[PDB]
Design a protein around this ligand. Structure first.
Ligand SMILES: Nc1ccn([C@H]2C[C@H](O)[C@@H](COP(=O)(O)OP(=O)(O)CP(=O)(O)O)O2)c(=O)n1
Ligand SMILES: [Cl-]
Ligand SMILES: [Cl-]
Ligand SMILES: [Mg+2]
Ligand SMILES: [Mg+2]
Ligand code: NA
Ligand code: NA
Length: 326
DNA sequence: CCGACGGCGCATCAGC
DNA sequence: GCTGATGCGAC
DNA sequence: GTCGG
């Protein structure tokens, strides 16, 4: 928050370009600029000063000058006034409504929360759950509740099969004092890059968490990724905890370190690291790190025995999770 | 210039 | 039914 | 919107 006013402005610009303009690269540019400015340890006094940071160019520098002089950006003031932009921006805050659906709903006269509730028949399953928990999903999760949630998931996972390992990643693993959701990496030795020796490995864990009423709703579910809703249990006479988003990713056990690197993030950190890998002649996904031939086609997976190995391949100093909140 | 911009799982739909 | 393109996802 | 070559 040293430069909170500027990073707020760029984040709002990013959301506009994403949600309304459907200009994903402009969205990514604004987020990169906000990220590099957020970690800049001086209170910025001019666009010129910010234009020294990689990712801040001529246009954003101009916007920082307008913002530092007036406290505001006319481009954003009129965006907030535009009814279509405001409606599209709002609707995309419902889980399952993306830019395209939001604009299509706006065309059909569906523009408000009350509009959405009247038109549940027009919503797919994901969207209906996002509407149902609209208020809950915008609340953050205190780290203390993340600790209680972790304890349930790991213990319940242990009850299904003592050989599962569940690791909470995302902002939690980066040490955040609050999280937007809970992200769980799951491994089991029967599932490796060589073979799947046991079916329903993710299903059995989802079922156990549903059985004890931790998982309450499913947004999407396949063999390796679960996206849904969970809730802490409350004591007698206690108000209920909000419902929370939970994501679970089942990763081949021999590919744990690439998987935990990916699932720890942040997303911008992953983008930065993967772009640098490319510049160094490697490609990184949640499973492997592979070299790029002269062709550009990926080669064979390189041996990985820690997170640090992946950093070493691309000639980066190791960064602890807490230092990856870009 | 101007081409690139990380990478992929699940849901839903068009076309066969 | 399958394959491939698209939306969505913090995207 | 920004960057590299
Ligand atoms: N566009 C994306 C989105 C996500 N990811 C990866 C990194 C996330 O940490 C990780 C979890 O994805 P996430 O959306 O849960 O992001 P968090 O860092 O946990 C921030 P939160 O506390 O949830 O509000 O998945 C990514 O690589 N690329
Ligand atoms: Cl774009
Ligand atoms: Cl791979
Ligand atoms: Mg998260
Ligand atoms: Mg998540
Ligand atoms: Na710059
Ligand atoms: Na949404």
């Amino acid at each position: 928050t040293l430069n909170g006013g500027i990073t707020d402005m760029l984040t709002e610009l990013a959301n506009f370009e994403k949600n309304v303009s459907q200009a994903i690269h402009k969205y990514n540019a604004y987020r990169k600029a906000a990220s590099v400015i957020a970690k800049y340890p001086h209170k910025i006094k001019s666009g010129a000063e910010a234009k020294k940071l990689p990712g801040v160019g001529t246009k954003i520098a101009e916007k920082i000058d307008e913002f530092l002089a007036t406290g505001k950006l006319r481009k954003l003031e009129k965006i907030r006034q535009d009814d279509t932009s405001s409606s599209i921006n709002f609707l995309t805050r419902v889980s399952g409504i993306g830019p395209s659906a939001a604009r299509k709903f706006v065309d059909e006269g569906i523009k408000t929360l009350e509009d959405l509730r009247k038109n549940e028949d027009k919503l797919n399953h994901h969207q209906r759950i996002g509407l149902k928990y609209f208020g809950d999903f915008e609340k953050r999760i205190p780290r203390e509740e993340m600790l209680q949630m972790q304890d349930i998931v790991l213990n319940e996972v242990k009850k299904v099969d003592s050989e599962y390992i569940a690791t909470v990643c995302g902002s939690f693993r980066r040490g955040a004092e609050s999280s937007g959701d809970m992200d769980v990496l799951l491994t089991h030795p029967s599932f490796t890059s060589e073979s799947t020796k046991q079916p329903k490995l993710l299903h059995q864990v989802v079922e156990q968490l549903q059985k004890v009423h931790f998982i309450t709703d499913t947004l999407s579910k396949g063999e390796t990724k679960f996206m849904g809703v969970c809730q802490l249990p409350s004591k007698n006479d206690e108000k209920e905890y909000p419902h929370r988003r939970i994501d679970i990713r089942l990763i081949p056990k021999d590919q744990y370190y690439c998987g935990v690197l990916y699932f720890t993030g942040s997303d911008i950190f992953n983008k930065n690291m993967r772009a640098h890998a490319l510049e160094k002649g490697f490609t990184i996904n949640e499973y492997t790190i592979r070299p790029l031939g002269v062709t550009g086609v990926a080669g064979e997976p390189l041996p990985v025995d820690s997170e640090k190995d992946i950093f070493d391949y691309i000639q980066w100093k190791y960064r602890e999770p807490k230092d990856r909140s870009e």
